[model samples]
Target: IVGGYTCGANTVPYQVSLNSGYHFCGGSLINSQWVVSAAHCYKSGIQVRLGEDNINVVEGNEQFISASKSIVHPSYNSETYNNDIMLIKLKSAASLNSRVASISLPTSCASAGTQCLISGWGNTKSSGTSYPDVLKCLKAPILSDSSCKSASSFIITSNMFCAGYLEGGKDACQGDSGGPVVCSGKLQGIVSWGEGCAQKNKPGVYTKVCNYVSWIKQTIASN
Candidate 1:
């Protein structure tokens, strides 16, 4: 994450790293058997690593397991990045502990100006390769829908929300897709897309998690 600090070990128990051979995306454990991430991050043979602090080191608290199945939102639009949410069913239920647990999903939508915490191991720079070994976090405030739309040249849909500094600085960059954005202690957004990491008039946009709560529950229940 750009302009963020390294997270303390086990501070983000619900945080997860999606790996094929290496970390590619971040996700959140919503339950013992389910993970919530951006649909754009989907790929076959994904391994979910829970309780990870540093990707370069073997942390004892980490739990590595393959995904049993993945379900991308049926209405997801790649071109516009709408309905970008996805759900992954774990091959095996994670063993919950202080260092490996699930986070509660949001029941209500977060309003504009809500301060949220976003964490990931994405690039620290807007360009080039600078992925961090340890997880990093940044506190960003949610921007109003009107402001978000006005700031970006890309179309901002109702299923998407923007957060970060208008002047550019802190944000979830490349490799951070599918990461969690927690507001009021609940998962509210999923890192999706943006113009750049954190550029002027280009705040990081996220999948509005609140808009997919029902879909998530239904998908989990039926599948």
Candidate 2:
């Protein structure tokens, strides 16, 4: 994430790196066998790397597991970037530990000005290829729906919410999609899209996870 700091070891136990050969996107472990991410991050062959603090090196705590299936939101709109959530079932249940565990899903929608933590291995800058090897994190505040709509040119739907500074300095950039935006230790959102990385009046948009809690539960229960 741009304008962020490296996360301490094991601080973000639920964070996962969505990889084929390399880190392509970020995700959150919501259960022993399921991961929550963005639909746009889906690929034919995905491997979820849990307990990862750095993508470049082999961390002894990491669990490299293949994905058994990926279920994208049926109503996901690629053009408008709406309903961008996705669930990935692991080939096997992850062994939960202090450095690898699931995060709780949101119990309620986050309010405006709620300070949330966004963690990822995305680009550290807005205009260059500078993705950090170590996981980075930024503390961003949720913006009001009206304020979010006014700040960006893209269509702001209820399924999405924004978080960042109006003046711009920090944000989730490319490669961060599907990463967790946690508030009060609950998964609040998934990094989805934005106009540009850390740009003024263009905060990062996220898939509102609170809105899909029931859908997630049902999808898992049936599948």
Candidate 3:
């Protein structure tokens, strides 16, 4: 059973795709240039609201960034659950400050005793209502890589991570896909999958951002 991973833990977990009303998942701002999120959350250009403690965030500063280009890991396969990372090239850099600043992506990742800040708008339970018109976030950590990987219910690897709800109560649900699992103020992982939205025995899984850091740097630079 996982330990943490709660809702309303993050500042802003909901992002609205400017092109489509398709509500997606994501986390807080890192810099105006980058707002950390999962690969699957990359849905072209979108609007991000940050720094609001209110889960029912009705109105706040909505910073916008145009995804000029997006690069999802070529090896990522949902069927197998590997390489679930990506980078987005924004049309222009955002203006960062207290409310609109970028959150730091991790340069070094610790093993045990590590704490991660996770955020998402995924369903609280199978039929639970997703946090509406607001963003949410939470904190968690990698418990046991071997145990997490060896567990048969989900997939894990050197490039993947497991965190959240030990008894499996709180977690990132369906709409939370492609969101950030932030640790040490840097992006350490990206939420990918779980058994079911906030289901028992199912903790949220994420793409280890550190594993694909190089790829992200190069991809974003080239774009």
Candidate 4:
């Protein structure tokens, strides 16, 4: 993350590393065989790496699984970043453990001003730098749709929301995309995009997970 510090090895167990032949994006383990991430992170032949604290070295507990299928939301708009969410079906169920667990989905939308935690292995800076080997986390305040829309020039749709410090300094950066945005111990959002890594008044945009709960459930059930 842009300004976050390294997270503990066993903390944020639901966090995952999506490898598109390389560690390209982050994701959250939603179920034994399902994961949620950003649609923009879509790439064929991707794999999910779980229960690992650092990517720079091999950890005996790391679970490497192939992605059997990926479903990008049909209405996802690359240009506007609307419905910027996707799901991956693992080839087999993930072996649950203390360091590898699924996150709980939110029953309702997270209200504004809620402090949320995000974790990822993205870049430390915005200069197109390399990603970190260890995971990172930052606590940010969630903003309402109206406030988020007013803060950015980009089109903020109903399915999208924003979170970050108003003064800037903390946010998810390049490699952090598709990571989990947890609020109140629940999965509330997914990192989608932002104008800059961490800029004043330019909060990081995320896909409002609550808005797509029904769609997500249906997809998972039918798939």
The candidate, 3 or 4, that scores higher on lDDT is: 4
User: lDDT per residue, candidate 4, 1-21, as tens digits?
Assistant: 988988989598999999866
Better of 2 and 3 by TM-score: 2
Compared with the true structure, all predictions reach lDDT values of: 0.92, 0.93, 0.58, 0.90
Expressed as tens digits, the lDDT of each residue in 12-115 for candidate 2 is: 99999999998999999999999999999989899999999878888699999999999999999998889999999999999999999899998889999999
Q: Looking at model 4, which ten-residue stretch has the lowest summed lDDT? A: 146-155
> Residue 189 of candidate 4: its Cα lDDT?
95
Tens-digit lDDT track for model 3 on 1-223?
1222334422333322222344556543445554555555556556544444343543565555556666567887756677766655557776555455555556776575588766655555456464544445566667676656555356567777787655655666766676666666667777787776656566677777777666666665665
How many steric overlaps are in each model, in order?
0, 0, 21, 0
Task: Please give the lDDT score at residue 56 for candidate 4.
Answer: 68
- Give lDDT for model 3: 0.58
TM-score of each predicted structure versus truth: 0.98, 0.98, 0.79, 0.96
Backbone clashes, candidate 4 = 0
| Global Cα lDDT for candidate 4 | 0.90
Off by over 4 Å in 4: 126-130
Q: Which tens-of-lDDT digit does each residue in 1-223 have in candidate 1?
A: 8899988988999999999999999999999999999999989999999989989899688899999999999999988889998999999999999999898989899999999999999999976768789989899999998887877766888899899988887788998899999999999999999987777888999999999989899889998
Model 4, residue 119: distance off in Å is 0.8
TM-score of 3: 0.79
Return the lDDT, model 1, position 103. 89
